[PDB]
Structure formats: C-alpha cells, structure tokens
From a paper:
Survival of motor neuron ([name]) functions in diverse biological pathways via recognition of symmetric dimethylarginine (Rme2s) on proteins by its Tudor domain, and deficiency of [name] leads to spinal muscular atrophy. Here we report a potent and selective antagonist with a 4-iminopyridine scaffold targeting the Tudor domain of [name]. In order to understand the structural basis of compound 1 recognition by these reader proteins, we determined the crystal structures of compound 1 in complex with [name], TDRD3 and [name], respectively. In this study, we identified some low micromolar antagonists with a 4-iminopyridine scaffold targeting the Tudor domain of [name], and compound 1 shows >4-fold selectivity over other tested methyllysine or methylarginine binding domains.
To uncover the specific interactions between [name]_TTD and compound 1, we also solved the crystal structure of [name]_TTD in complex with compound 1. First, when we mutated the aromatic cage residues of [name]_TTD that have been shown to be critical for histone H3K9me3 binding to alanine, the binding affinity of compound 1 is not affected significantly. In contrast, when we mutated the R296-binding pocket residues, the binding is totally disrupted. Second, the electron density inside the H3K9me3 aromatic cage is either smear and can be modeled in multiple orientations of compound 1, which implies that compound 1 does not bind to the cage specifically, or is of no defined density shape. Taken together, [name] used the R296-binding pocket to specifically bind to compound 1, and this R296-binding pocket could serve as a therapeutic venue for designing potent small molecule allosteric regulators of the [name] functions. [name], however, did not bind to any other three-ring compounds, because the substituents on the pyridine nitrogen of these compounds are too large to accommodate the more enclosed arginine-binding pocket of [name].
Numbering used by the authors: 133 to 162, 179 to 282
The structure:
C-alpha cells in the first residue's frame, strides 16, 4: 500500500505513544487492512515490529517557526513526561496555549500518549515543533 519496503518512516509505539525513526522491511495484509513491519534505525538487534497503518508516516521534518505556532494546531513535538524539563520523545500534540513576553516564550500542548492524553504539558523545545502531513 501507501509506504514501501525500504522506505524511511516514523513509526509510533502504540504502548507509549511516541514516534521513532524506522524503516519499512515488510508489508502484509490483516490501507486500514495493511500491516507494516518495521525496524528501528539504531537497533537492528531489536528486530521487527508490526504496525498498523495509522502508526506509520513518512518522515515529516518541516519545522513550524515560533511565530507561526497556533493554538489548535496538531503538531509533532518533543516532551519527557517523567522529567518535564529534559529532552524526551516525539509525540503528537495539540497546541493549547502560547505566551510571549520580550524575554520569555511559553508553549503548552495536549500531548497524546496513545493510552491517555496529557493536557497542558509545558513544552520546552519550542523551536523544534514539526508539522504533521495529514
Ligand atoms: C520530528 N522528529 C521525529 C523524530 C526524530 N528522531 C527527530 C525529529 C526531529 C529531529 C530528530 C522521531 C519522530 C519525529
Ligand atoms: C528508546 N526507545 C524506546 C522505545 C522504542 N520503541 C524505541 C526506542 C528507540 C527506538 C524505538 C519504547 C521505550 C523507549
């Protein structure tokens, strides 16, 4: 179907909701009837994982500049639920709040963990928010 053997993709671990860089190694039937089998780029040793089509995307690397961020946008961004001031994983999220002074910028989003959602997370890496194609 939509993504091809050997295509570089992002794949979402449906347990934890985070997206990781991966490669399609095999495509089988069960687009909603397609199963992607992927390997994560720096972990050949961890084998192949089966993904539903909704948990695979082309690698979208279009940054949305600070000024263009808007409340209500569903975007891809970096968050760490266990240490919220630190670098974490990549998640889908809906921008919920945006605040700026001359010296400070704050961004809040409702982060999707697949299982639950996490409203108004404070997002630290406001200059690495990415667009979702869709
Ligand atoms: C947006 N992004 C994503 C992933 C990355 N490793 C990197 C970016 C940006 C740099 C590395 C995984 C899923 C989305
Ligand atoms: C670090 N990591 C983690 C998970 C992954 N699926 C992948 C990585 C790296 C690529 C795939 C689940 C929890 C942590």
């Amino acid at each position: 179907g939509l993504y091809k053997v050997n295509e570089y993709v992002d794949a979402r671990d449906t347990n934890m909701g985070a997206w990781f860089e991966a490669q399609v190694v095999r495509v089988t039937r069960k687009e909603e009837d397609v199963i992607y089998h992927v390997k994560y780029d720096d972990y050949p040793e961890n084998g192949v994982v089966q993904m539903n089509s909704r948990d695979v995307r082309a690698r979208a690397r279009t940054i949305i500049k600070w000024q263009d961020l808007e409340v209500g946008q569903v975007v891809m961004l970096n968050y760490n639920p266990d240490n919220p001031k630190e670098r974490g994983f990549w998640y889908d999220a809906e921008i919920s709040r945006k605040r700026e002074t001359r010296t400070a910028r704050e961004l809040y989003a409702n982060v999707v963990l697949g299982d639950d959602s996490l409203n108004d997370c404070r997002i630290i890496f406001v200059d690495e928010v990415f667009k979702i194609e869709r």
